């Protein structure tokens, strides 16, 4: 609740093409503003990530090498056409606020793509076009187009594939060809990307979280003037460390605690742990899980 900006992993919330916001997004901590991550905490907006708040974001995942970047990491909306992203971008209805030059997402290939404008141009309110900016200052970050969370995983999902009842096309993916009169609508569809899989769209979203005493399940803080503090400096029980630490019952169950000489205090992050998802009856460990609003066409049978 109070430690939403104490990030798991490195905490990097910048896109590679945009550097000048590194003083406050690299990493994100208790203090400072970050246009790439702050927008994720407006309540009611991004509910799935706000549920699993202590799991990584997309930019956060690519800078922890969990999610790979696509070839050209940014598609142009001013070039000859700038096609590599447009085919995937049109099928999704999104809404970009003003002053944003870039907006990122998980492509259908499982990598992080982004759509970006030339300097001092901004994205329109549908994220499909670039226009000469109307203000004086552009946002120095990239706007996430997906309610999403990510984690490290080695679970092979190459055998997996999108299966949805009565669906002909979901976003880019064409599951089959249909002869019946179709119903077409923008739907908020869930999805998940795995180790060796593409984007797998889902009918139901069934998740389960196994809690553990691993490092990413904790948040440590020292001297509101709180600043983050690496847990790797705290020595475990029967180990060696450079600092001294105290924690809750969960933290002191594994690491040694000293109530008087501790540099920092570590709590157990609520809603943290290994998350698994149920795809067509089988439980798997996904790399990322999210929602996105895409064009779904359905048969009448």
């Amino acid at each position, epitope marked *: 609740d109070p430690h939403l900006r104490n990030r798991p992993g490195k905490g990097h919330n910048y896109i*590679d*093409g945009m550097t000048q916001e590194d003083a406050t997004c690299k990493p994100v901590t208790y203090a400072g503003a970050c246009s790439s991550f702050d927008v994720l905490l407006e309540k009611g907006k991004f509910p799935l990530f706000q549920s699993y708040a202590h799991h990584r974001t997309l930019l956060e995942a690519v800078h922890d090498t969990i999610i790979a970047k696509a*070839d050209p*990491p940014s598609c142009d909306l001013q070039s000859a056409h700038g096609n590599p992203c447009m085919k995937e971008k049109l099928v999704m209805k999104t809404h970009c606020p003003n002053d944003y030059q870039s907006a990122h997402y998980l492509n259908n290939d499982g990598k992080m793509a982004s759509v970006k404008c*030339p*300097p001092k141009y901004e994205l329109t309110e549908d994220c499909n076009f670039c226009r000469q900016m109307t203000g004086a200052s552009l946002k120095k970050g990239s706007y996430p187009l997906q309610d999403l969370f990510c984690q490290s995983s080695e679970d092979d999902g190459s055998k997996l594939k999108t299966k949805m009842k009565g669906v002909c096309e979901v976003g880019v993916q064409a599951l089959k060809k249909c002869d019946g009169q179709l119903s077409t609508a923008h739907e908020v569809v869930p999805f998940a990307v795995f180790k060796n899989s593409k984007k797998v769209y889902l009918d139901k979203l069934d998740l389960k979280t196994e809690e553990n005493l691993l490092p990413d399940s904790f948040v440590c803080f020292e001297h509101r003037e709180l600043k983050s503090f690496d847990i790797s400096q705290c020595p475990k029980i029967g180990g060696h460390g450079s600092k001294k630490c105290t924690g809750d019952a969960a933290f002191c169950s594994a690491y040694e605690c000293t109530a008087q000489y501790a540099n920092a205090y570590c709590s157990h992050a609520n809603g943290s742990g290994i998350v698994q998802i149920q795809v067509s009856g089988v439980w798997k460990k996904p790399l990322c899980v999210g929602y996105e609003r895409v064009v779904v066409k359905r048969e009448l049978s």
Partner: antibody
Framework: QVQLVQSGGGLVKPGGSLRLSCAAS????????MSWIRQAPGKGLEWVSY????????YYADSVKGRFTISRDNAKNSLYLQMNSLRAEDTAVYYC????????????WGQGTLV | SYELTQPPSVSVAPGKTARITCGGN??????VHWYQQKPGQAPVLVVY???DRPSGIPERFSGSNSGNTATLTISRVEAGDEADYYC????????????FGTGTKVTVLG
């Protein structure tokens, strides 16, 4: 520190071919676009081509389009420019540059190589 | 094609201030970059993003951009500032995508 360092011969007869190679050491080089900018003797700078961090989506300038081929070997941290069907208008000093995204400002450049 | 115009010569006495104007149609809407090149060298980025400096460039260098003119201003000119200064922009038109100016040679008097 970052040190884009170049090699490659630069004395040929018209219609010939050459090959410049720019080796990178100090950044990741897998996340940065790479461009080639030439400078005629005494004149200013002309951009020639750019290659994306992954190797796909290459762009050339119509002055050079069709003749040169820019490639990269991210494994061995290198960036190649193969020149074919050369002629006197190409005689210049060629530099490699890194931008970190397609719209950006060409931070550190190679040392230069005459042709 | 989008062209950037640049005065070929600029003389300035040491201690005075030097000014170099990059002229492009509607250039206030693009990000302007300034490189410095000494003889026998490679161009070095002295200014990017219309007004900002990479680490290593002294506070003597300042960038500005408005309307149809973007100016690089070198305060406290030193004899070592004799060089070619080039402006550069991105332009997704007519095949160049990175338009360098004609270049300005700054020579220090005295």
């Amino acid at each position: 520190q970052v040190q884009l360092v170049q090699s490659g011969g630069g004395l040929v007869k018209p219609g010939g071919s050459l090959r410049l190679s720019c080796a990178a050491s100090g950044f990741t080089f897998s996340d940065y676009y790479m461009s080639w900018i030439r400078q005629a003797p005494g004149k200013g700078l002309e951009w020639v081509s750019y290659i994306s961090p992954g190797g796909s989506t290459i762009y050339y300038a119509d002055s050079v389009k069709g003749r040169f081929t820019i490639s990269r070997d991210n494994a061995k941290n290198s960036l190649y420019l193969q020149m074919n069907s050369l002629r006197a208008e190409d005689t210049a000093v060629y530099y490699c540059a890194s931008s970190a995204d397609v719209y950006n400002w060409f931070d550190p450049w190679g040392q230069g190589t005459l042709v | 094609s989008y062209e950037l115009t640049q005065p070929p010569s600029v003389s300035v006495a040491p201690g005075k201030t030097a000014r170099i104007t990059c002229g492009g149609n509607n250039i206030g809407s693009k990000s302007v970059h300034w490189y410095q090149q000494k003889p026998g060298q490679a161009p070095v980025l002295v200014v990017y993003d219309d007004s900002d400096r990479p680490s290593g460039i002294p506070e003597r260098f300042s960038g500005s951009n408005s309307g149809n003119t973007a100016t690089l201003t070198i305060s406290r000119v030193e004899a070592g500032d004799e060089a070619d200064y080039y402006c550069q922009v991105w332009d997704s038109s007519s095949d160049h995508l990175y338009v360098f100016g004609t270049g300005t040679k700054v020579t220090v008097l005295g």
